Design an enzyme around this catalytic site. Sequence first.
Site, PDB file in Angstrom:
ATOM      1  N   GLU A 171       0.825  -1.201   0.000  1.00  0.00           N
ATOM      2  CA  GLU A 171       0.000   0.000   0.000  1.00  0.00           C
ATOM      3  C   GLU A 171       0.861   1.254   0.000  1.00  0.00           C
ATOM      4  O   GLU A 171       2.083   1.199   0.157  1.00  0.00           O
ATOM      5  CB  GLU A 171      -0.929   0.029   1.224  1.00  0.00           C
ATOM      6  CG  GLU A 171      -0.267  -0.352   2.563  1.00  0.00           C
ATOM      7  CD  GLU A 171       0.993   0.433   2.871  1.00  0.00           C
ATOM      8  OE1 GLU A 171       0.890   1.659   3.038  1.00  0.00           O
ATOM      9  OE2 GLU A 171       2.083  -0.194   2.941  1.00  0.00           O
ATOM     10  N   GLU A 314       4.689  -0.053   1.037  1.00  0.00           N
ATOM     11  CA  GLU A 314       4.775  -0.222  -0.431  1.00  0.00           C
ATOM     12  C   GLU A 314       4.802  -1.666  -0.934  1.00  0.00           C
ATOM     13  O   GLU A 314       4.765  -1.888  -2.149  1.00  0.00           O
ATOM     14  CB  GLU A 314       6.039   0.453  -0.996  1.00  0.00           C
ATOM     15  CG  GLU A 314       6.181   1.934  -0.694  1.00  0.00           C
ATOM     16  CD  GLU A 314       7.377   2.550  -1.421  1.00  0.00           C
ATOM     17  OE1 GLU A 314       8.002   1.847  -2.243  1.00  0.00           O
ATOM     18  OE2 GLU A 314       7.675   3.725  -1.170  1.00  0.00           O
TER      19      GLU A 314
HETATM   20  O1  LIG Z   1       4.490  -1.185   6.375  1.00  0.00           O
HETATM   21  C1  LIG Z   1       4.744  -0.725   7.615  1.00  0.00           C
HETATM   22  O2  LIG Z   1       4.933  -1.434   8.573  1.00  0.00           O
HETATM   23  C2  LIG Z   1       4.723   0.818   7.575  1.00  0.00           C
HETATM   24  C3  LIG Z   1       4.995   1.295   8.934  1.00  0.00           C
HETATM   25  C4  LIG Z   1       4.996   2.722   9.038  1.00  0.00           C
HETATM   26  C5  LIG Z   1       4.779   3.638   7.993  1.00  0.00           C
HETATM   27  N1  LIG Z   1       4.529   3.019   6.715  1.00  0.00           N
HETATM   28  C6  LIG Z   1       4.281   3.817   5.461  1.00  0.00           C
HETATM   29  O3  LIG Z   1       4.207   5.190   5.724  1.00  0.00           O
HETATM   30  C7  LIG Z   1       2.824   5.655   5.463  1.00  0.00           C
HETATM   31  C8  LIG Z   1       2.042   5.602   6.685  1.00  0.00           C
HETATM   32  O4  LIG Z   1       2.667   6.415   7.708  1.00  0.00           O
HETATM   33  P1  LIG Z   1       1.839   7.603   8.377  1.00  0.00           P
HETATM   34  O5  LIG Z   1       2.715   8.239   9.427  1.00  0.00           O
HETATM   35  O6  LIG Z   1       1.463   8.704   7.254  1.00  0.00           O
HETATM   36  O7  LIG Z   1       0.594   7.034   9.002  1.00  0.00           O
HETATM   37  C9  LIG Z   1       2.274   4.756   4.356  1.00  0.00           C
HETATM   38  O8  LIG Z   1       2.459   5.259   3.005  1.00  0.00           O
HETATM   39  C10 LIG Z   1       3.022   3.412   4.639  1.00  0.00           C
HETATM   40  O9  LIG Z   1       3.300   2.711   3.408  1.00  0.00           O
HETATM   41  C11 LIG Z   1       4.507   1.659   6.497  1.00  0.00           C
HETATM   42  C1  LIG Z   2       7.540  10.292   2.464  1.00  0.00           C
HETATM   43  C2  LIG Z   2       7.246   8.854   2.000  1.00  0.00           C
HETATM   44  C3  LIG Z   2       6.296   8.079   2.716  1.00  0.00           C
HETATM   45  C4  LIG Z   2       5.997   6.767   2.339  1.00  0.00           C
HETATM   46  C5  LIG Z   2       6.654   6.168   1.180  1.00  0.00           C
HETATM   47  O1  LIG Z   2       6.324   4.807   0.812  1.00  0.00           O
HETATM   48  C6  LIG Z   2       7.589   6.890   0.450  1.00  0.00           C
HETATM   49  C7  LIG Z   2       7.908   8.256   0.831  1.00  0.00           C
HETATM   50  C8  LIG Z   2       8.933   9.058   0.032  1.00  0.00           C
END
Ligand SMILES: O=C(O)c1ccc[n+]([C@@H]2O[C@H](COP(=O)([O-])O)[C@@H](O)[C@H]2O)c1
Ligand SMILES: Cc1ccc(O)cc1C
Lengths: 346, 346
Positions: A171, A314
Site C-alpha cells: 500500500e 509499499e
Molecule cells: O508497512 C509498515 O509497517 C509501515 C509502517 C509505518 C509507515 N509506513 C508507510 O508510511 C505511510 C504511513 O505512515 P503515516 O505516518 O502517514 O501514518 C504509508 O504510506 C506506509 O506505506 C509503512
Molecule cells: C515520504 C514517504 C512516505 C511513504 C513512502 O512509501 C515513500 C515516501 C517518500
Amino acid sequence: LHALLRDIPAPDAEAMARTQQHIDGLLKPPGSLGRLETLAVQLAGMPGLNGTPQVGEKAVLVMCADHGVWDEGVAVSPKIVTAIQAANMTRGTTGVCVLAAQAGAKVHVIDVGIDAEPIPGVVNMRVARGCGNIAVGPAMSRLQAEALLLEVSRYTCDLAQRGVTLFGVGELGMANTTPAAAMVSVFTGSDAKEVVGIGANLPPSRIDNKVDVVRRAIAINQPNPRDGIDVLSKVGGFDLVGMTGVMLGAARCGLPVLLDGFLSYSAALAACQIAPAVRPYLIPSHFSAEKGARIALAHLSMEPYLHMAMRLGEGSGAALAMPIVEAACAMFHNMGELAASNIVLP
Amino acid sequence: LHALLRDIPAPDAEAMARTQQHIDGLLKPPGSLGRLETLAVQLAGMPGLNGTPQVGEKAVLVMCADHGVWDEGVAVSPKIVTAIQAANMTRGTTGVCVLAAQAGAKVHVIDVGIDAEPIPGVVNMRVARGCGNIAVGPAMSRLQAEALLLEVSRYTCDLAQRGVTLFGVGELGMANTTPAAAMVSVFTGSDAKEVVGIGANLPPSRIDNKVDVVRRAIAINQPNPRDGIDVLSKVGGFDLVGMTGVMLGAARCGLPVLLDGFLSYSAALAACQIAPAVRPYLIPSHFSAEKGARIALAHLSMEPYLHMAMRLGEGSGAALAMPIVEAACAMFHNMGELAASNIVLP
Ligand SMILES: O=C(O)c1ccc[n+]([C@@H]2O[C@H](COP(=O)([O-])O)[C@@H](O)[C@H]2O)c1
Ligand SMILES: Cc1ccc(O)cc1C
Ligand SMILES: O=C(O)c1ccc[n+]([C@@H]2O[C@H](COP(=O)([O-])O)[C@@H](O)[C@H]2O)c1
Ligand SMILES: Cc1ccc(O)cc1C
C-alpha cells in the site's frame, strides 16, 4: 461476493502428505531445513499450484489511497506524497520497485482512492478522492467496501490466468497507520495506546494526539469486531480494503499471498474475520518496526521470516521475501535423496 | 600469521559517512528501510568494496572434516556421511548447493580433514584423517591450527583477486556440534548444559552424555579463553579452524563474510578473540535452532536477519541470506531521491 467467499477452496491434504514424505527423504537430517520445509508443504496444499511447491510469475499489488484523517494532524508527510510516490511507482524508482526487480516480480500500482487527478499508467479503481475522516464518521459506506473487495478480488484472480502464481501485497497512503491501528485495536481488543506507532516518523510528542484520534474513531463509529466488512468500512481506508481484496482473490484462486508490514497485518485480520478459509494462503514476510506489529501478528498466529526493522510499506517486505519462497521450491525439486546415497539414519 | 593479523584494515569511516548521507536522501522516510540501511553502510566501509555497497561474484566455502569425538557416541549420523556428503557437494545435490545456485553463488568444497580416501574434485587441504578425540586430549597441535589458518586465509583472499566480493562460510562434519559447544562454553563462560544442543537429531536421552563429553574436554585440555588459537587447537576441529581462516582471510582482504549457523558462531567467537579487527566484516544470516545459538550470538552482539529454525549447516543459511546483501546494494544504487521529486520532510 457471497459466492466468492463460499468458493474459496480448502487446502489439499493429499498433496501436502505427498510433499512431506518427499521432503523427509531429501539429503539432510529430517526436519533440518525447518521453516523452509513447512513453507514447502504449505505451498503444496494450495490448489492453484497444482500439487507441488512451485513459483511461476510474481506480482506485487500496491494499493494507493488518501485518508481524510490526515487532517487530524496524525502524519508529518505532506498529503501530496501519495500522488507523487504513486507516479514514481510507474518509473521504477521506489523502494518496492527496486526490491521487486531484484526478485523478478512485476509491480502493479492501483489507485483505489488518491486525492489528486488520475495518474497515467496507474490502474484506475478509484472509489473517491480520499476516504472520509474516520475521527468524525465512517471512511466509506458498506456498499463501497463490498464493491471494491469484489473488484480487486476479480483483478487478482484474473492475473492468475496470466501466469502469476505468487502475490505480494502493498500500500501507499499518507496517514494510513492511523486506520490500521484502529482496526488492529478493534479486532484484537487491545487498547489504542498499545497498538499506535510512529508511522512515517511522527514525532514522539504527537503520539498522544494520534492515540486520541484512534479512540474517537472507534467511539464514534462503533465498528462490530465480528463483522470484518463493518470494521473496514467504518475505521479503515480504501487502500486497506484493497489489500483485503487481494487476499480474498488469491485465496479464491487457490494461490499464495505474501504479507508486508503493519498495514498488511490489519488487512489480514479483516480478511480472516470475513473468511477464515483465507488463512492457509497467507505467508508472512517481515516483522514491521511499527509498535503494534507484535499484537497483530500474535492474533494471526504468524511468525515472520525476516527481522529487518523495516517500516517503509509499499509491499517492500513482501518483495524481499519472494526469494525465500523460491528457495523452498528449489529445495523441494532440486535436492538429492538419502536413499540414492545409501545413507540410513535412525 | 602475525603479519596477516597486523594488516587487517580498519573500516573506512569516510566512505561510510558518504553512504549514510546518500541513503538519507533516497525516496523514503529517513531510516524506514531499517537494517537494510545499516547493512549498506557497513558494506560501504569495507575497503575491498571500493567505497560503495556492491556485490560482484559470490562464493560459499564449505570446510569438511571428521572428528575423533564421534567415538564418544555424541552423534547419530554414521561417520561416513562426511565423506559421502562431501562428494555430493561436487554433484550439486546438497542443500547448500541448491541454495547457492538460487543466489548465483559458487560452492567451494574443501577437505581439511575427512577420515576417508581423498575425494576427486574437492579442494585438498587435509591436515589428517579426522582430528583427535577432544574427550581425551587435544584435537590438534598449535602448529597445525596455525598452519591451517594461514593456508585457508591465503586461499580466501586469493579468490578476491578472481572477482569474489562476498563470502559465505560453511562446514560439514559428523559430531562437530560437540567441539562447537565446547568452544562456545569456553569463550562465553556458560555452563555446557546451556549450550549443548541436539545437533543432527541426537535423541533427547543421549544429551546427558554429550554434556558430560563437553565438560571432560574442557577439564582435560584446559583451553585458555584469552587465546583463540589455544581454544581451537584443544577443543575445536579442522572444520572449525578452517571457518575461522575464511573469516581472517576475508577481513585481511577487506571483504564481507556471511556467517551460517551454530558451528559458524563458534568459529566467529574464535576469530574475534584472535583479532578484534575481524568483527566489522562479519554479517549474520540466520538464527540457528541449536540450543546454544542465543548465547553465542549475544556474545558476538549479533542479531540474524532470518528466523527459519534451520539447523542443516553446510553454509545453507549463508547462501539464503546472499539476496539480502544484494538487496541492500540495489536499494543504494537504484532508488530515486527525495529532492528530485520535490518532497520535503520535517
Ligand atoms: O508497512 C509498515 O509497517 C509501515 C509502517 C509505518 C509507515 N509506513 C508507510 O508510511 C505511510 C504511513 O505512515 P503515516 O505516518 O502517514 O501514518 C504509508 O504510506 C506506509 O506505506 C509503512
Ligand atoms: C515520504 C514517504 C512516505 C511513504 C513512502 O512509501 C515513500 C515516501 C517518500
Ligand atoms: O549449522 C547449524 O546450526 C547446525 C546445527 C546442527 C547440526 N548441524 C550439522 O549437522 C552436523 C553436526 O551434527 P552432529 O549431531 O553430528 O554434531 C554437521 O555436519 C552440521 O553441518 C548444523
Ligand atoms: C545426515 C546428514 C548430516 C549433515 C548434512 O549436512 C547432510 C546429511 C545428509
